[PDB]
Structure 1
Amino acid sequence: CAESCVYIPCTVTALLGCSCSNRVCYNGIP
């Protein structure tokens, strides 16, 4: 996903169902 949760939880990618992992939002794809 195009969002890093390093300092903040997924926002745009949150709507995509992106989960925070290794400080970066992922959901099958980055």
Structure 2
Amino acid sequence: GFPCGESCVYIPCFTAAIGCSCKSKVCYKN
């Protein structure tokens, strides 16, 4: 639910490294 400080329109979340995932063009964790 919280933004990880990275967007993800065409490129995936580098913040997957800290457990974030792309939702609504934004990288989020819970």
- TM-score, normalised to structure 2, is 0.70
Q: Which runs of 5 or more structure 1 residues have no equivalent in the other structure?
A: none
* Matched positions, count: 27
Q: Which residue of 2 aligns with 1:18?
A: 20
- TM-score, normalised to structure 1, is 0.70
Identity %: 67
Structure with the bigger percentage of strand = 2
Please say if 1:2 is aligned against 2:5: yes
Structure 1 vs Structure 2 CA RMSD: 0.9
Paired residue secondary structure (2:7)? coil
Q: Which runs of 5 or more structure 2 residues have no equivalent in the other structure?
A: none
User: Hey, which bits of structure 1, 4+ residues long, moved more than 3 A?
Assistant: none
